[PDB]
Design a protein around this ligand. Structure first.
Ligand SMILES: CC(=O)NCCc1ccc(O[C@H]2O[C@H](CO)[C@@H](O)[C@H](O)[C@@H]2O)cc1
Ligand SMILES: [Ca+2]
Ligand SMILES: [Cl-]
Length: 136
C-alpha cells in the first residue's frame, strides 16, 4: 500500500520506498532498524537514485548500505546488490575511500553532490536511509 507506507514517513521513488531517519545509529544498528521494517540500508545503482538521495539528504550525513566484505575487504551492498566498482567511482567524494585511521569499513552520503560518499568507522553514529522495494 503506497499511501499507507508513505504516510508512515517513507518516500516513494522509482519503484522503491525510502526512509530517512531522524535518530542517529551505528551502521549495523541502522541496518537492524531497516531489517525490522522489511528493508535494508539503501543501495545506490544509478545517477538518478544518487541524485534523489543526496538532494533529499539536504547536506546532512546518512549511512547507506555500503560496507566492506569478503577476505579482500571489497566494497559491497548489504541488500546483496552486486557492487559495480566502475559505475560507483563517480559517486565517491574525491580522495575517498581513504580508510582514515585504518578503520573505515562502512559508507555514508556525506556531501550534497553527485560526488557524495565517504568511508567512515562502522561504529560511529549517523542518520541513516532504509530502502524497500514496492511489491504490488
Ligand atoms: C572536520 C574537521 O575538523 N576536519 C579536520 C580534521 C579532520 C581531518 C580528517 C577527518 O576525517 C574525516 O574527514 C576525512 C576527509 O578529510 C574523511 O575521509 C574521513 O572519513 C572523516 O570523515 C576528521 C577531522
Ligand atoms: Ca574517509
Ligand atoms: Cl528515526
Amino acid at each position: 500500500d503506497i499511501l499507507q507506507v508513505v504516510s508512515q514517513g517513507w518516500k516513494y521513488f522509482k519503484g522503491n520506498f525510502y526512509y530517512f531517519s531522524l535518530i542517529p545509529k551505528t551502521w549495523y544498528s541502522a541496518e537492524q532498524f531497516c531489517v525490522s521494517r522489511n528493508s535494508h540500508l539503501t543501495s545506490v545503482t544509478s545517477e538518478s537514485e544518487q541524485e534523489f538521495l543526496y538532494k533529499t539528504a539536504g547536506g546532512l550525513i546518512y549511512w547507506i548500505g555500503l560496507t566492506k566484505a569478503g577476505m579482500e575487504g571489497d566494497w559491497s551492498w548489504v541488500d546483496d546488490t552486486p557492487f559495480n566498482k566502475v559505475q560507483s567511482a563517480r559517486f565517491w567524494i574525491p580522495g575517498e575511500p581513504n580508510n582514515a585511521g585504518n578503520n573505515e569499513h562502512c559508507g555514508n552520503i556525506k556531501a550534497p553532490s553527485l560526488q557524495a560518499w565517504n568511508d567512515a568507522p562502522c561504529d560511529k553514529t549517523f542518520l541513516f536511509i532504509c530502502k524497500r522495494p514496492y511489491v504490488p
